């Protein structure tokens, strides 16, 4: 037998000094009350059949009442695991937010009046028509002035436009150089389909979830996957989509699967956050010699090194349709904007 807890036990015996014999428990799992009798890893320590119970035990309130736990050394709560969902957006492509947009509209609005003013010195329609033409690659019939000063002012419009277009390529190139929603399941069958979620219902996870949310527990009895891997395979096959278990095991299982197809809900959701520990005899008097020894390994470099050796898995967390359909929202205001202009012109002469 070898692993994480065993490594701590071997290290503990060095500093303290004792002889230990492992006593793998035949009875099922960690602990449970059957109205008078305790079984599992905690049943054989209350009934004076052992002196310590090392393993993946979790601190609770009933257990801490009758036994004395040590200082927690691994975090653990309640978590849910789901599969992996099937864009990189830019609303209007936002070159520098609606700041430069105000500048170009205001600049082009003022110049039209200025250019029209200088034509009297030498055109309400021709000046405005040519001005928005050249800045947008022309391609429209626009009057070309025969003067000298007029042609110079119009000329400097193009070079500003193209470099804007070149810069309009930079921001799009910028975004690619730099280079997820779980609003569902938030309902006890109140969602439209029959939602399925299940546990391994013998441990503290059921006891904690049995007191609160009584309605969920009664419905949850339909799904009683009596394993971890058996529940895992059924989850991938689509039979189940939510698995609730320890947050120090579900996270590990979702941190070594191929393809990064299993990500827990949220970004490491934990609910109770009751850490692990070592059960004792309630009168063992070994509680003090363990606490100081354990608090040392949490200090500088001991515990913070073991987890790299055992729990260090890989495959962690990490143009579409709406990207180009962002200016489409401005297409919905195209015909509407032009429609009211005709109505405004109609009422100019009629009224």
């Amino acid at each position: 037998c070898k692993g994480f807890c065993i490594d701590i036990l071997k290290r503990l015996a060095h500093t303290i000094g004792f002889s230990y014999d492992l006593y793998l428990v035949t009875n099922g799992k960690h602990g449970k009350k059957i109205d008078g009798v305790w079984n599992g890893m905690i049943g054989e320590v209350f009934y004076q059949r052992a002196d310590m119970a090392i393993g993946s035990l979790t601190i609770n309130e009933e257990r801490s009442e009758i036994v004395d736990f040590s200082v927690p050394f691994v975090e653990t709560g309640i978590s849910v695991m789901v599969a992996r969902s099937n864009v990189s957006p830019s609303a209007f492509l936002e070159p520098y937010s609606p700041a430069v947009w105000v500048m170009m509209f205001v600049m082009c609005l003022t110049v039209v009046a200025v250019t029209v003013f200088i034509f009297e010195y030498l055109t309400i329609g021709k000046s405005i028509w040519l001005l928005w033409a050249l800045v947008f690659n022309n391609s429209v019939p626009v009057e070309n002035p025969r003067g000298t000063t007029s042609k110079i002012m119009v000329l400097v419009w193009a070079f500003f436009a193209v470099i804007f277009l070149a810069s309009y390529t930079a921001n799009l190139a910028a975004f690619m150089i730099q280079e997820l929603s779980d609003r569902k399941f938030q309902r006890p069958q109140e969602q439209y389909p029959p939602l399925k979620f299940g546990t391994v219902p013998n441990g503290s996870t059921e006891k904690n979830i049995r007191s609160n949310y009584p309605d969920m527990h009664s419905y949850m009895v339909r799904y009683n996957q009596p394993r971890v891997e058996e529940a895992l395979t059924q989850l991938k096959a689509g039979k189940l989509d939510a698995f609730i278990y320890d947050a120090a095991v579900l996270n590990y299982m979702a941190r070594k699967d191929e393809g990064c197809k299993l990500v827990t809900i949220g970004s490491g959701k934990v609910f109770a956050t009751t850490g692990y520990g070592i059960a004792l005899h309630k009168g063992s008097r070994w509680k003090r010699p363990i606490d100081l020894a354990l608090l040392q390994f949490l200090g500088d470099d001991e515990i913070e090194m073991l987890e790299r050796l055992w729990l260090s898995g890989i495959c962690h967390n990490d143009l579409d349709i709406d990207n180009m359909a962002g200016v489409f929202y401005m297409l919905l205001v195209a015909m509407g904007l032009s429609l009211l202009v005709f109505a405004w012109e109609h009422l100019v002469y009629w009224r």
Partner: protein
């Protein structure tokens, strides 16, 4: 290489026309573990042979090069058939008496240093990893490849909706086929378009359309730029400490060369016997066939000296080495204890480094700079 039909084994010239130096190399042929072995004269040449000839002239001694019976290096190889242990391979032959000097790639470590001397290294190197190179094809894309092909009919339909109602509003308030030339032409940015709009509703609509023109082509320019930037499988085993090596997953197989120095290195370590306990069954008789196995996709990684693997990777452009060096120890001429040649041999190697002689050997036997 096998000899010719006569006693000699052919002659050839190098890149500069100098004659390559060869020495008769007697040893077993057709190894085939499990078949009788016969001794047939062959000839050997290369790095160590050229260095050996230099020492023979300098210190005035004669030689007769012969190969090894079993193609394995030294290893303690403790067995129950003997009292404690007995040396095997090249190392055992030196102590037996059949060998006086050892000239071959041979790492310097603690175990072999308790019985034999080592002189000074020729070159310094370390261990590394050899893996199969990724797909040579760049997956270069053609026209209509980026962006959804189906929605490009929508872009084709985008001009369709603009074309139909452009002249439809030119009849009621004030031909239908006479308007699409301007509408289609402007997105071509050509001179075909000639109809300047007169109605204010169409005049505004014409200009706001223009803003739609340049965005796609610039985006398509970026999308093409996307095709030449984003390429990263991120499949790089980083050092020995990578968690993939620690877990003995069956999707990849690790292997090495039997009875080499790396086998001693892993066995001695009191922690590493957790992965190679499963990779011990996956080994090889020599390093000349593990490369073929990797090339045939029957393996995933290989551990060997960087002196050989780097040369192989350069020669054949189907493999790329990765990882970082983690055990550095040079080679060296090996001889038995109390041998009187030790003092002279060590000085010649040191004097050869300063003379630049090793630079000539490197550039005619190691560096080929092919398919870089």
């Amino acid at each position: 290489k096998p000899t010719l039909s006569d006693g000699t084994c052919k002659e050839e010239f190098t890149v500069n026309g100098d004659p390559v130096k060869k020495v008769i190399c007697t040893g077993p042929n057709d190894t085939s573990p499990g078949s009788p072995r016969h001794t047939v004269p062959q000839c050997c040449y290369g790095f160590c042979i050229d260095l050996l000839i230099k020492l023979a002239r300098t210190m005035n001694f004669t030689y007769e090069v012969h190969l090894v019976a079993d193609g394995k290096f030294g290893t303690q190889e403790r067995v129950n058939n003997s009292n404690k242990k007995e040396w095997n391979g090249m190392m055992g032959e030196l102590l037996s008496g059949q060998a006086d000097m050892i000239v071959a790639p041979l790492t310097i470590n603690n175990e072999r240093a308790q019985y034999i001397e080592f002189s000074k290294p020729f070159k310094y190197q370390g261990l590394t990893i050899l893996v199969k190179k990724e797909i040579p094809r760049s997956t270069l894309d053609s026209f209509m490849q980026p962006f959804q092909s189906t929605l490009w009919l929508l872009v084709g339909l985008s001009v369709h909706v603009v074309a139909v109602m452009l002249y439809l509003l030119d009849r009621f308030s004030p031909t239908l086929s006479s308007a699409m030339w301007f509408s289609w032409g402007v997105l071509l940015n050509s001179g075909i378009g000639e109809g300047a709009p007169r109605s204010f509703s169409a005049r505004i609509l014409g200009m706001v359309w223009a803003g739609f023109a340049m965005i796609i082509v610039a985006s398509y320019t970026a999308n093409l730029a996307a095709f030449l930037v984003l390429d990263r499988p991120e499949e790089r085993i980083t050092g020995i400490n990578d968690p993939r090596l620690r877990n003995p997953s069956d999707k990849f197989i690790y292997a090495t060369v039997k009875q080499s120095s790396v086998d001693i290195y892993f066995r001695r370590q009191v922690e590493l016997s957790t992965m190679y306990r499963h990779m011990e069954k996956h080994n090889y008789e020599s390093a000349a066939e593990a490369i073929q196995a990797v090339r045939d996709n029957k393996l995933h990684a290989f551990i060997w000296d960087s002196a050989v693997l780097e040369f192989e990777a350069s020669q054949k452009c189907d493999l790329v080495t990765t990882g970082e060096l983690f055990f550095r120890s040079g080679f060296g001429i090996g001889m038995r204890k109390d041998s009187p040649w030790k003092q002279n041999v060590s000085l010649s190697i040191l004097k050869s480094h300063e003379n630049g002689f090793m630079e000539d050997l490197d550039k005619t036997w190691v560096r080929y700079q092919e398919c870089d």
